[PDB]
């Protein structure tokens, strides 16, 4: 037998209880980053290596800008939840 | 400037809303597994690779045993939550 909740992976744009940022002109930070990394390594890196690089890019490359002092220069960090039981590669 | 929530990794023995099993004579499933993999690859595998093999071992080598039909033959799958921004190796 195998666990019913097994082999799922949830890549969330942000951590529990927090906001997630989106630029009306360029799109959300998480999505920009995810695509940017997948184009370069989607076929030669493992799913966790990709998502980890996504975490790093969203964390270092983005900072919010707003006229409202309450919402400017804020940061973000994605959250990966893995129930995977094997390594996942999109190639081969 | 980096996210205050960055660089955390939570390795839960089970998924949200679920039970976590522990055999009284051998110890909890999650820990027996975590230690097997660690004493064998703790120094040559990336953290996510280690925790992934742990998920697999838990999900495959364990199954509850109980004289209580309701808790008989149940399964378990760990849950890894990573906000890490780089690959982690316990060496060099």
């Amino acid at each position: 037998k195998i666990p019913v909740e097994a082999d799922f992976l949830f890549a969330y744009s942000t951590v529990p209880g927090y906001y997630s940022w989106r630029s009306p002109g360029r799109g959300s930070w998480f999505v920009q980053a995810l695509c940017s990394i997948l184009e370069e390594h989607g076929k030669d890196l493992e799913i966790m290596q990709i998502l980890t690089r996504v975490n790093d890019r969203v964390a270092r490359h983005f900072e919010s800008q707003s006229d409202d002092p309450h919402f400017h220069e804020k940061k973000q960090i994605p959250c990966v939840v893995s129930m995977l039981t094997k390594e996942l590669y999109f190639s081969q | 400037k980096i996210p205050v929530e960055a660089d955390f990794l939570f390795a839960y023995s089970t998924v949200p809303g679920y039970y976590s099993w522990r055999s009284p004579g051998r110890g909890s499933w999650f820990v027996q597994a975590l230690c097997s993999i660690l004493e064998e690859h703790g120094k040559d595998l990336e953290i996510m690779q280690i925790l992934t093999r742990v998920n697999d071992r838990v999900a495959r080598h364990f199954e509850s045993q109980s004289d209580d039909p309701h808790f008989h033959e149940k399964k378990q799958i760990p849950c890894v939550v990573s906000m890490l921004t780089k690959e982690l190796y316990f060496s060099q």
Binding site: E46, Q49, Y89 | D44, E46
Partner: peptide
């Protein structure tokens, strides 16, 4: 290290 398929 180097992830190896």
């Amino acid at each position: 290290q180097g992830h190896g398929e």
